[PDB]
Design a protein around this ligand. Structure first.
Ligand code: 4N2
Length: 33
C-alpha cells in the first residue's frame, strides 16, 4: 500500500495521518501521492 517505511497513524481527536518508522517523518496527506 504505502511507499517504503511508511504506515497509517491517527491523532487522539480522530484525525488520520501517515508516519515513516525508518526516519520519524510524517504527513497529513498520502506519501508519494
Ligand atoms: C487533530 O485536530 C487537527 C485539526 O485542528 C490538528 O490540530 C491535529 O491534526 C490534531 O490536533
Amino acid at each position: 500500500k504505502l511507499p517504503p517505511g511508511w504506515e497509517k497513524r491517527m491523532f487522539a481527536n480522530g484525525t488520520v495521518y501517515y508516519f515513516n518508522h525508518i526516519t520519524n517523518a510524517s504527513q497529513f496527506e498520502r506519501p508519494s501521492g
